[PDB]
RNA sequence: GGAUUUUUGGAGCAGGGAGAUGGAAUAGGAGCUUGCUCCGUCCACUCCACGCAUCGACCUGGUAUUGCAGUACCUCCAGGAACGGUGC
């Protein structure tokens, strides 16, 4: 058993891939990501269907989107 | 009468067994979550281990790892293994 | 009330909001990414828990397909924003 | 405040979750102001899926309906009250 | 604090509002809760494909808004 | 508080009601046991699924988060909510 | 009755808050205010604030 | 005697017998038809139970109308501007009216709305060929005199007065 | 604060309407006041005919707007 | 009092292919207006795979019922698809 807390935060700053809800795969550090499950990554680079496009970097997102998040 | 059998009762014995289950979607019922999950907590935000995505139309798998999936997007599982 | 305020102010700053924090000490001109693909550019002036952010500067634009999709442009300078409709909150855009 | 409380009774145009327009004499507010709308109706776009077709909206009465919270898009008054 | 109390500071104040359903509209609303509700009035609204239809007394709703214009002369640190 | 839509919603469960959902799931029938969160249990409905193929079923569990609206009694138009 | 708005009076103040509107919609500029507004919509024919070669000018005919 | 708008808003309308939004002003035999747009979109049924009107015509552009009793009145003729301002229109109730002969029939062939009509208690009725003046006007006509319309009747009312 | 009525239902069949236009065919068998109704001899229908048994569907009502009843309970 | 039932949202989007088939008067670009060639938004006809099935209302003729009760909607056969959303 690891729950969100220990796990999203041993992953906030592992480069996490974040699928959002729209194809949008975040590879980045997470920030932190608290019980408002507001994710914010640090140089974090856009994906659509796992395809490297965007340079943002450090980009803060609502939880709204995430459908889901791993760190690769 | 008869007492609740929780869904919280059913995803906790799911992860004290360690098993892999495939799990539905919201709004697109072609695609399913195959992995197993590694805890949980009071919000039933389930979280995932060696999962990926399982096409049904285009029958293709795309796997994550130890995902953490959104919580309002599940709908249930099926225990495959 | 005021330690509450006090742990809401140490929230938005060091924790995931810290983008718009930023845009709120930095003045900082931050792409707040919709869940609906309408791509506003501007700063963050009024900004909170729940992403509620208010956007100085803001230029709203969209792939609009009339053909192959043009990008639709405007910008409003001052205009609000709900966090409802927002996927994101980012800090720093390459423009 | 409570702003509908005044125009309520008279028949209003309540808008959708899928953008119709359904002009019942509403009634009441709530904190989720879910609507209790009587006498009321609805019209949605009956779409040609062309142009030298042409669109128009094929009349529905519910009576009266109680539209769940999640419902409005907005409320505006297409009919004076009776 | 929220800046929803931030749009708490309009009344009898020149807003255009683009909502959920693809809308953009010119509003002088009526009244605004906590909540976000803000009633539109002399509302020229505009959805997805649409044209400039007209309320003068209309309820526009919260999470069913978008985005928010606040008056030019409106003080921004003044009005949050 | 507790909502007049409530009220409502309770004078119009125990007999014909017509509820209409989300995609078009539209249930017509006995909306039998209606709980303030408004999920909506039905008896002996004809319920659609927008399909044009408005079937019978018996003792349905329609939700009422999805609930687009919900056709009442038209004889309590004189309701103590409104009056 | 529909031939006077709010502040206009009937006779007494004009709309140009709208075509105000419009121009910084187009130009977004933020230094755009009252005495730029002022100046391009006091003036006839000057060598103008915007350029008339894009849609400028039929926003300014609207 | 002045028929004005207060008979229109005050007029009553709400459902109908077949669950329409209809308009009721009868008891008036208001021989005026004026002000009556202020029905504000919310209405499709018109009626003037009770009416002197000199003849059919006087209606504001009402592109929803569905109903309209211009029964118990003076109608003498049809007018012209009837579809542009009723396109929706199926029901124009005119029975026990006075239309007399087939020229009061000149406006009636240009809605394409037309299925459910009603002329009843005219001199236009025990007339021969009439009912076929009728069915030929009247392509997408259903309801006449209260029974269906006939693919016979229509060979008739084509075929004959060439 | 208040739990869901599948009180009598309980422990009997019904076949749920849930996102996605699923089926889940099934007996009422736990729930939370989140009413999240968990089926066993509960298996999937899908678009297409289908069909798959899932052992034990602890099925949110975060997506389930239907469910029909297959007896009187 | 922004986490599985209503108000901090899963919303956005795009209409299947083609024939020396065609309309843009006042509205598209280049070949520097007219003529003519090719080119990135629809509908009418026709070929497929009338985009595919269900059902509902209706138009057609035949056909069973003379009957009192407060309606989701009440005949049966057969054609056609003028209209709606449900699975791909």
């Known amino acids: 058993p690891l729950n969100p807390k220990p796990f999203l935060n041993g992953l906030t700053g592992k480069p996490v891939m974040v699928k959002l809800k729209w194809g949008m795969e975040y590879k980045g550090y997470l920030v932190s990501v608290d019980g408002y499950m507001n994710m914010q990554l640090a140089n974090t680079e856009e994906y659509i269907d796992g395809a490297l496009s965007g340079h943002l970097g450090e980009v803060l997102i609502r939880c709204n989107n995430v459908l889901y998040i791993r760190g690769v | 009468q008869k007492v609740m059998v929780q869904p919280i009762n059913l995803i906790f014995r799911y992860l004290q067994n360690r098993s892999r289950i495939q799990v539905w979607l919201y709004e697109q019922v072609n695609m399913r979550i195959e992995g197993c999950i590694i805890g949980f907590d009071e919000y039933m935000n389930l979280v995932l281990d060696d999962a990926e995505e399982i096409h049904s139309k285009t029958k293709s798998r795309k796997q994550l790892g130890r995902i953490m999936l959104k919580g309002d997007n599940i709908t249930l599982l099926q225990s495959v293994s | 009330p005021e330690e509450l305020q006090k742990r809401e102010e140490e929230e938005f700053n060091t924790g995931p909001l810290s983008v718009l924090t930023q845009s709120v000490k930095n003045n900082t001109q931050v792409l707040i990414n919709c869940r609906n693909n309408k791509k506003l550019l501007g700063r963050v002036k009024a900004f909170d828990r729940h992403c509620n952010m208010v956007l100085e500067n803001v230029k709203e634009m969209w792939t609009e397909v009339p053909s192959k999709p043009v990008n639709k442009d405007r910008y409003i300078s001052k205009m609000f924003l709900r966090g409802d409709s927002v996927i994101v909150v980012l800090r720093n855009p390459l423009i | 405040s409570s702003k509908m409380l005044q125009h309520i009774d008279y028949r209003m145009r309540c808008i959708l979750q899928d953008g119709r327009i359904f002009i019942g004499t509403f009634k009441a507010f709530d904190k989720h102001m879910n609507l209790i709308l009587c006498d009321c109706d609805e019209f949605r776009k009956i779409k040609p899926k062309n142009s030298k077709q042409a669109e128009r909206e094929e009349k529905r009465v519910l009576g009266l309906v109680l539209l769940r919270g999640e419902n409005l898009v907005s409320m505006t008054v297409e009919g004076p009250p009776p | ?58 309820s526009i709703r919260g999470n069913n808004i978008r985005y928010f214009i606040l008056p030019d002369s409106l003080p921004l640190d003044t009005l949050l | 508080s507790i909502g007049v839509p409530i009220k409502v919603l309770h004078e119009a469960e125990g007999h014909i009601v017509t509820c209409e959902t989300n995609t078009g799931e539209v249930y017509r029938g006995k909306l039998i046991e209606a709980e303030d969160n408004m999920n909506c249990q039905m008896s002996n409905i004809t319920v659609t699924y927008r399909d044009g193929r408005v079937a019978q079923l018996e003792q349905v569990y329609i939700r009422g988060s999805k609930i687009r609206f919900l056709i009442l009694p038209d004889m309590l138009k004189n309701a103590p909510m409104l009056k | 009755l529909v031939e006077f708005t709010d502040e ?46 894009a849609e400028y000018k039929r926003y300014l005919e609207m | 005697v002045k028929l004005t708008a207060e008979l229109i808003e005050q007029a009553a309308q709400y459902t109908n017998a077949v669950r329409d939004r209809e308009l009721d002003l009868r008891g008036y035999k208001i021989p005026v038809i004026e002000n009556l747009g202020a029905t504000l979109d919310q209405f499709d049924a018109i009626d003037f ?54 020229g009061d029939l000149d406006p009636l062939a240009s809605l394409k709305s037309l299925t459910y009509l009603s002329i009843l208690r005219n001199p236009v009725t025990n007339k021969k060929h009439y009912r076929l003046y009728v069915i030929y006007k009247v392509p997408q006509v259903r309801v006449l005199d209260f029974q269906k319309v006939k693919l016979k009747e229509r060979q008739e009312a084509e075929k004959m007065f060439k | 604060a208040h739990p869901p009525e599948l009180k009598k239902f309980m422990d009997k069949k019904l076949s749920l309407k849930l996102n996605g236009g699923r089926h889940v065919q099934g007996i009422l068998r736990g729930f939370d006041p989140f009413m999240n109704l968990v089926i066993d001899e509960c298996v999937e229908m899908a678009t297409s005919g289908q069909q798959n048994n899932i052992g034990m569907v602890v099925i949110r009502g975060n997506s389930i707007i239907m469910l029909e009843a297959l007896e009187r309970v």
């Open chain 8, 49 to 102: 139970s009770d009416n002197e009107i000199r003849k059919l015509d006087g209606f504001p552009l009402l592109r929803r109308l569905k109903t309209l009793l211009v029964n118990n009145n003076r109608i003498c003729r049809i007018g012209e501007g009837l579809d542009q301002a009723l396109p929706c229109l199926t029901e124009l109730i005119l029975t026990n009216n006075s239309l007399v002969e087939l």
């Open chain 7, 8 to 53: 206009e009076g009937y006779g007494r103040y004009l709309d140009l808050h709208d075509c105000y509107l419009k121009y910084i919609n187009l130009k977004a500029s933020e230094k755009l205010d009252y005495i730029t507004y002022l100046s391009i919509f006091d003036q006839l024919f000057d060598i103008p604030k915007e350029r008339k070669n």
């Open chain 5, 1 to 58: 604090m929220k800046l929803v109390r931030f749009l708490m500071k309009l009344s009898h104040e020149t807003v255009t509002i683009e909502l959920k359903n693809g809308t953009q509209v010119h509003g002088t609303i009526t009244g605004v809760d906590v909540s976000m509700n803000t009633h539109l009035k002399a509302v020229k609204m505009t959805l997805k494909n649409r044209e400039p239809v007209q309320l003068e007394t209309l």
